[PDB]
Amino acid sequence: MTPHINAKIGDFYPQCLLCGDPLRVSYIAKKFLQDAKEITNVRNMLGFSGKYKGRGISLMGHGMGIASCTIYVTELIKTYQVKELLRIGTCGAISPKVGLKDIIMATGASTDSKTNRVRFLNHDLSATPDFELSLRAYQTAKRLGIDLKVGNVFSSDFFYSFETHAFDLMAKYNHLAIEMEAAGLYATAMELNAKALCLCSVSDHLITKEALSPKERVESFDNMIILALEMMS
Template sequence: MNYTDNGRNFFTETPHIKPKGAEIAETILLPGDPLRAQFIAETYLEDVVEFNRVRGMLGYTGTYNGNRISVMGTGMGIPSMSLYSWELIHVFGVKNLIRIGSAGAIQDKLNLYDIVFAIGASTDSNYAKQYHLPGYYSITASFDLLEKAKQTADRQGQAVHIGNVLSSDIFYNEDSTALNKWSEMGILCAEMETAGLYMNAARAGVNALSILTISDHIFREEATTPEERQTSFTQMMEIALELA
């Protein structure tokens, strides 16, 4: 039997998310790494309840500054992000989805640990084909979340870059010139999830935003460690948590 509150379904489960009655909040943070989700829950949230661990994709709900908020890993790539975000939206009633992830810089003005707000997401993915659109779709963030995130960053004294990012299906690209071409079009950085999240959110009429931390600079061969990516991208996390 399902329990609903204002149309939101708390006891429903999917093959990938099994809350067992635990709440999933209307606002959720979505790191790719489930261990980053665990770090956020343990470091920032109060009254934490685990709502998922299927396939190791850890999910938690708690309170931050008196507001209910959830956090869950999504894995790598548009297919994984799209699967989890679709279920969170359509099955569990999530309204605000904030990706907090890492990205590789492809512009000289970006440095390690810089923060990027993705106002748009260019992509080499064919994910939009399912919509049978009679042209090319411009993939953009929700302005309400983007505006609130910028105001939060300003209050916290955090400098951010706002612009277009690349969501690529390809990590090891046979075309060694591909990122140079995207860079020439003003793309700030490359990652693998934002375009799928934004399309799912737009189609469902909910809000989405990607907040990214530069984990490596592709052209300068600079990089952070996996451990640093898991636990030290706290500026990005603290901006996102204020969006609940």
């Protein structure tokens, strides 16, 4: 129906888990869902619908960066009637308050993008998640025994930053890590009256240069997948 999704209307459940990497979306479908069906594959951006503990859930890839994420989120809401969007992904830590394998709930997404100024009268849009979803993540993490870290992230247009000298200042202002999509998800969900939240897993520390190995990346990401699926039950 859209240039970027070839699902039929109704193929998506009203709650959708989002991730930048469509191969990880496929991995979640195979490992954690029952009866999962591939519903879209335009540009190799895979999405699925299946069941977790008897509950229907959808999964959709969104690519990297605010511009890509905004395209998919816009279409999910406007065309596919998605109401609740839970994004997961990795991030690079910049604060001493977090370490490798930590899960962060982004109560705000700062950015170096111009997109929110374009959307919002050239002023400062404070891009934020839906509070009910934030409460649900916090409650579910308490239930599962997960030490959820809570603060802002910085959504950058740059993976290869030209402003590494500014990381300490961002950490001072309660930015725990850097990723590339949260501000676009939040602003699009705000634009279109939908509920959204971003969780992210610390795979790399940008201050120490320490990184997880491939094997511990998969293990730690699984912990955040389970948090997300449990919160959608």
